[PDB]
Amino acid sequence: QIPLTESYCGPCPKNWICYKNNCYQFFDESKNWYESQASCMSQNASLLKVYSKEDQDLLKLVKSYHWMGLVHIPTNGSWQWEDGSILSPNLLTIIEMQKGDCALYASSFKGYIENCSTPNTYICMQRT
Amino acid sequence: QIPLTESYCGPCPKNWICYKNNCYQFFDESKNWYESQASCMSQNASLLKVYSKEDQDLLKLVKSYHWMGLVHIPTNGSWQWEDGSILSPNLLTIIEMQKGDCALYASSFKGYIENCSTPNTYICMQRT
């Protein structure tokens, strides 16, 4: 019946989810990947980025598929985040059943290749 | 490209999930319902209580089954929360496929009757 802790969680937008100082918001208003990235920025953010299984383990409980910021730019390149930031090793296991240059996040760190024009729900993220 | 908001989220235990001023924590260390309620209290809390689809809509994204504080006490009574607090109308849709006096929470406000002795993962909650 140990030392009770009690701390606030680093500024986040209003009514957003806060965890290990990262802010999340789950939008159910299905939109294509482009329209999707717009909403996030509109509220000053981007689509959910996966950078570490320790500070985002909550991510293991998400149900269904949702848009994240992983995209493939035909530069004869690899997959990356919409911000030019590099995907790191030992994080995501990617799945391919469709043709696409965008990806939906699935529970337990996995990316599903999906058409960027296909509407879907999405998750925005804002660090601190 | 509207008014950016930025607010902390009401004290919560350390590294817990914070949302609309309610604290959640997802434990993957499977235990029966009793052992389960003990952990939560141990950190000063109880198993996840559902009181409103507006302040707990995040709950719609939880995957799998998890222990919550809904139990049936044979007092020729109804289902209630471990704290004597009453379950309210128009919240949960209950499912029964097993014999039990405890319930697992399932995504989209639903309760599954389960044996209280059967181990399962659980979610603790602390209001503010």
Swiss-Prot record, chains A, B:
One of its GO terms (biological process) is signal transduction. Residues 11-126 form the C-type lectin domain. Keywords: Adaptive immunity, Cell membrane, Differentiation, Disulfide bond, Glycoprotein, Immunity, Innate immunity, Lectin, Membrane, Receptor, Signal-anchor, Transmembrane, Transmembrane helix. Glycans are attached at N44, N76, N115. It is a single-pass type II membrane protein. The keyword Electron transport does not apply. Residues 1-128 are extracellular. Expressed in natural killer (NK) cells, CD8(+) alpha-beta and gamma-delta T-cells. Expressed on essentially all CD56+CD3- NK cells from freshly isolated PBMC. Expressed in interferon-producing killer dendritic cells (IKDCs). Induction: Up-regulated by interleukin IL15 in primary NK cells. It is found in: Cell membrane. Functions as an activating and costimulatory receptor involved in immunosurveillance upon binding to various cellular stress-inducible ligands displayed at the surface of autologous tumor cells and virus-infected cells. Provides both stimulatory and costimulatory innate immune responses on activated killer (NK) cells, leading to cytotoxic activity. Acts as a costimulatory receptor for T-cell receptor (TCR) in CD8(+) T-cell-mediated adaptive immune responses by amplifying T-cell activation. Stimulates perforin-mediated elimination of ligand-expressing tumor cells. Homodimer; disulfide-linked. Heterohexamer composed of two subunits of KLRK1 and four subunits of HCST/DAP10. Interacts (via transmembrane domain) with HCST/DAP10 (via transmembrane domain); the interaction is required for KLRK1 NK cell surface and induces NK cell-mediated cytotoxicity. Does not interact with TYROBP. Interacts with CEACAM1; recruits PTPN6 that dephosphorylates VAV1. Is not capable of signal transduction by itself, but operates through the adapter protein HCST. Some families of ligands for human and mouse KLRK1 receptors have been characterized being very similar in structure and highly likely to be orthologs. In humans, an additional distinct subfamily of ligands (MICA and MICB) differs structurally, having an extra MHC alpha 3-like domain. This is NKG2-D type II integral membrane protein. The lineage of its organism: Eukaryota, Metazoa, Chordata, Craniata, Vertebrata.
